[model samples]
Target: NFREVIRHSPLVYLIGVAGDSGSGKSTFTRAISDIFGEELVSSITVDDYHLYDRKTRSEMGITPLLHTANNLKLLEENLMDLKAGRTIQKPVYLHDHGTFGEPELFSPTKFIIIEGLHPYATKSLRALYDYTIFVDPERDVKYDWKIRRDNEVLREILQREPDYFQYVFPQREVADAVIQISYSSYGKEEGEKRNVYRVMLSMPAQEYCFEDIELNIDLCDLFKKSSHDFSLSCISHTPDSRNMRALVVDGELMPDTIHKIERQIEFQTGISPINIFRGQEHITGTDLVRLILSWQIINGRIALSN
Candidate 1:
């Protein structure tokens, strides 16, 4: 029955990554696409669906965060076309100028990743995804990230963005998988403390089972090897009928530790290692979370073939 679901699906495997503006959606999506190889993965940003330019939105007292400001119907149509293995002329939203640029034609690929604020906003768009991810950061953590990214006064963001936050925050509930990122304070001194992240991963019961058990075990083992303090809560399947399994990683891991874990996973599963960290000096918790989800996609495809 699971195989039937795979067989009946389109040649293109669509993955949707949705999150609030500062929730690491871009980084997570990039890591997954890199693991699958950029040639095989087509990346789409849903921000391009904004229907109005910055000037217009400002004049109308609208933030791009609202559903009414986005052309979701067009996004749904484009995703449908991609799922049906057709090429599409996708619009480009220029952030620097806050306006639309010329449309670019995109050909269907083996894998397609859609990421941004509203990827999971509608059921029709959600149905097009083989996998859906929601990146949710703690409120304070998100504010910190946004302040750093925009180089704006903290007070301005806090005072101006409540409506936007409330409008887009609930989309997380529709996701099949949720990645929660938060900071862990280490030292008593303000400057001495470092930020750590906790990742909570969930998958539907229909698509998860004992084969996935090995991956969960290795992940916990990987977190243990990090010289830095980390906690991995017990992995368990939900007691209810949906039977979803959840794994939580509550601290940071070194890139080398992750490399070692990948080696062990490759040995056990016979899948080649994915260079998840690339050449980075260190990998963040966000990177590790994306690596696990990408592995899920790869593992699922292998299972379907068998």
Candidate 2:
């Protein structure tokens, strides 16, 4: 059965699309707008906040394309306002030539589509949006788009300063969803020739843990769903039952994968793994008690016992 959630305030959906330069960030936004209609949705780009120009950034020994303070605060505020049911004037940066333009009037709408690099990089910003997406294209496709976008003046700048692009690549870790696009229709067929081949050949053979869906916990309903189960185990530990020992559930899981699960849980609940999980290995019967307690504390499900 499907359940519906009713909220007091109107639900404003904020969608974030991020990728490297020339990774179809704009194209993806356009495709979405076409279906939803321009009037129903408002779209904005984070690049409009660049602090420096091509000439000045080169002299300063910095990458102007890299995200920084110039646009961060403004972008954060605009999104916050949109989520709050207020309208905001968004900043616009001209793309034809390197220039910072004036702030344009932008209002809130039913759907807000924000596209650019580093849109989902920060945790605080990530919290504001309901959905986030990352567009990852092949390295060659990325470079090809770069070459076409900035043929002469821009190409020279990128060659001299490759560090900026390399540094930003690691931000992929924060993506909630990823969209892998092909440069050409046949690109998917030529997946065998991708640069991933080199990594596959050189790296030691090991199991790659790729799950179909990322697991995110909603701690709100934990107690209501399993309070009886938890109480049963708690009662079993009483003097009458002689089963007061902390129970641990044993299960098979990849050793290194524990940290990843722990991190996500910590991020959602703001509690340490040691406090949430009872055992060092797999979750046991005793672990269930701690998991529910932690969820209760985080979601205000119950009063603190100790």
Candidate 3:
């Protein structure tokens, strides 16, 4: 088939990854970037859009989870510019010190990931994304991540749940894929019980085209040679009676299984971007998520490229 160039195929794709604090957004974003080649992918953490720093937020009785706490209008403008091949100066909100840094220039790449608590808070902002992913970890899982990563106390973190529900959780409705993480049936990771986890990727079956990407894993060996407590299933289920499908993978998996699945994905996409981590610790459910996300993104880039 002959092809026509459309506006030279301005093919920069936008991905919005939103979630509550300590939801493992960075880890997931890194996996996708690793798959797409780090040089060809750039990230804009919407955390940078926070309108107030840590001390001020507390003094004013507000948390960053609220839309009013962020400068989303400028975020919208910058994301639009990046999509159109224009670079823009963006604000930098430092997580470590809970303050604002000097604004930095941001240029777009083949895939641009806008990740944070409020990436899709506005209609105009939500409209700009090609694919949106919301990472919702179970409360216990989130608390564990928060304490470990932020050194924040539990009482302070627990107080944000109301804000999380009021502002952040609502974005779940707008996401193309909602990674709902739960506890694992198997034992702990690195001897930490909270490290053990499972992930259920809930998506609109017809639109996201994850339904189109074949899951090329070994079912024969999966059934017969099962060594650990691993499990995988794609079922027709809806959370709110919508046309949704949930793909669930539970427990940690073996090295051989992880490798075979990773190779299958690379073969399918012609891109070997999947980086296997924690080989001795066994592949966590997040590793499986890395592969599936890699597949969906390639499929999405094709549609956008055309």
Candidate 4:
């Protein structure tokens, strides 16, 4: 039955592959694509949506991860159009510079492969896709791979420390199905056992990605599971003299207070107050605030003005 259902929409499948750079995403994509065949497949990188170039990121004095200038809506829109049997121009991201480069011509057929850090990161994006895969390797091995990859990318460009390794890697806790790339000579039985162990150990870290609403949706099937119901939370702020922006909250904020704080965000980011309530459960004050921030970035609405 499931196979029949999948066959009905054979032209579209939301496949994701995420891992540290040089963790073999290209290798994985190539293998899968070879089996699926080029006629049935179109592969794209999530990094192409990056907001800044490496030089611009450093010049701007901000981590590119913190910005949302990337064109997510355009990407999503293009994906939809292609699935509908349309030819379009896809985006290209220059990682060395950390910015989108040019619009490359793309014609879609059946399967689409997406590889990157934040592909399945968000709930809405997760819902849009069919299957998601995470390629996870040992931390030490990943580090070695990243250093080597960085050295190659940096040869012609200015050399800089690999900031993303420290700032971005932790976010993988939210991945769906993770495949470990290890040096074990074990057979299928041993591999199966190791998978169970890795899943158990990784579950808690993955829990970090579960926002209140997402957690509620996930726990809905469990009769005994319930939310830690709280009607209020606090909002506090700290001044950053280094940047022109002043109010950065450091501690836990009350939910009600966060809602009030989000008013300013809504005004600046231009995200609809409605999108705050997009997912499961009624919109909580916290949801409104977080969605507003996400919308601001996805829409390129971030402004320094309060």
Candidate 5:
């Protein structure tokens, strides 16, 4: 599929995924690679560009989220080479020891994922992305994720918002796909006990015309599921002006309904519906977004092919 999409295309298509350091950017990138393949899709973390090691940061009493803490200049310089398919020595940020490791020689693949805090910080860098995404989980979700990843950073993370909110969050406005994940509101259902989450995707207007693929809502499960497994609305829109589509993929869904929709798409489409379902009994909202984004990447390739 990577080769299929790029017969007439360039060396690489940079897909910028911006988010806070622990905002689950990897989860989004990894699934997209499955649609293509890991061999043809390369990624580099922006944290690797940190100018200060963890010890230095604590000594300076500054948040790493601050712009000065990372080497954007070096990132941009290396990006220029990557655009031309040139190899460069990319720095390594060691999370375990909180320091830089040896530089690794890197080469570009068909797609390059540039993900981390400030990929979309400047105009030139923002424009470099063929497709852009922002992972913006709500506060509790962010706190939970970060707290779990680096439990010892509790004190620094607690004071990180002033710098993070000032620098990183503004990119959400310019992102082509904005992901806002939060807690589920499934008090009545057993999903309260299930591994459920409420995830919302705010997406851009299509560059080319793409009529939405319709899947019927389950008639019987409507009451139980709130008819909201894939609830959608246009938060920012004008049929004449620019429009933005937003939707929520609630984890609370009836089992019978899943089979109904899968069997429907199975007949109507060329893509196998099974790839989207895996073996998970109750698919999380993150998994649901994976399907939708892959559909977009497929359509994106089709647009480029056109």
Candidate 6:
């Protein structure tokens, strides 16, 4: 089975990150890459697997968010090859020009990250991933991010498509973990400003299995630190039929606070820290969200080795 293949493969650890447009998938991927280093990580975007060009989708009344509009078979094949430690020539979807470009040959590295709209659309492809993540920002928060990042014309087209949300949002249920990004309106003034996001990460306790390692560290206790703007809780029931534990952070953690949390994690897991704090000085809510997930990935790898 694919699961056994992935469990035994010493070649690469494959991770899938799926999200709506402007939901911070790129930023999430970058954070993970920063932790592992770019040299050891191969990141691939599902946008490159689009079956139709932008023009074709418009003409055919198809939204790119739909699974039928993607070349999932090719994506699956590529994942299988990468898992087997083989190289592949991946197609490129030029977003700026709204067309397909030449395929680029890429070799597998220590890690393979697949990020895009429909990364979990197919079972075969999903099976190839050692872990999966879904980024689901609040509706209004996503709209705000999209308007700021994209042109008005593109936004108008997607906004009117009823099928867009219908197809894309359900992918969250299939994810091993879900990151919900919203804004904290605390200390609000009249004018709009750079919103401080509140990220809620719902994770399967069994998936990460940190109970034994974190015996000495109380995640809830760490929340009391002024520099740490996060809280921890356990969810008995989730929409996905899985009992989960949640780590909710209202905003970014300061440098000192991050170090405090890192020290606890290192002490508990007995894993020496590397460059876990290699990114910006002032971490954003999104960055912190990815950091927590990265810790899980690290622990998961350790578990596999044992």
> Which candidate would rank higher by lDDT, 3 or 4?
3
* TM-score for all models, in order of appearance: 0.78, 0.54, 0.86, 0.50, 0.82, 0.80
Q: What is the C-alpha lDDT of each candidate?
A: 0.68, 0.50, 0.75, 0.46, 0.71, 0.70
Preferred candidate (TM-score higher): 3 or 4: 3
Kindly list the per-residue Cα lDDT of model 4 for residues 190-213, writing each as its tens digit. Answer: 222222111111111122211222
- Candidate 1 has an lDDT of 0.68
What digit string (tens of lDDT, one per residue) describes model 6 on residues 1-306?
Answer: 122333455758888999888888998898777665665577999999998997887788667877777888888888889889889988999999689999999898867889998887776667788789999877777776667556644655465346556766777877888998777644222112433566678876664454433212345645665543434344545756767777665544455546654555555434446335443454555656666777777666556555
Tens digits of per-residue lDDT, candidate 5, 213-286, equal 44345667666634445343336543213367777776544444345444443433333445554424555666
Clashes of each: 0, 6, 0, 8, 0, 0
lDDT of 3 by residue, 178-251 (tens): 89887676653532553447788988855545233444455565566545566888887766456788888887
Which candidate's lDDT is highest?
3
lDDT of 1 by residue, 197-221 (tens): 6666766654543253232324454
Segments in model 3 whose C-alpha atoms lie over 4 Å from true places = 1-8, 188-195, 207-226, 258-261, 264-281
How much does each candidate deviate from the true structure in C-alpha RMSD? 5.2, 17.4, 3.6, 17.2, 4.4, 5.2
Arranged by TM-score with the best first, the candidates are: 3, 5, 6, 1, 2, 4
Q: Using lDDT as the measure, what is the rank order of every candidate, best first? A: 3, 5, 6, 1, 2, 4
Segments in model 6 whose C-alpha atoms lie over 4 Å from true places: 1-9, 151-161, 185-195, 207-237, 260-284
Question: Worst 10-residue stretch by lDDT in candidate 2?
Answer: 195-204
Q: So what's the TM-score on candidate 3?
A: 0.86
| Steric clash pairs (candidate 3) | none
Question: Model 1, poorest ten-residue lDDT window?
Answer: 186-195
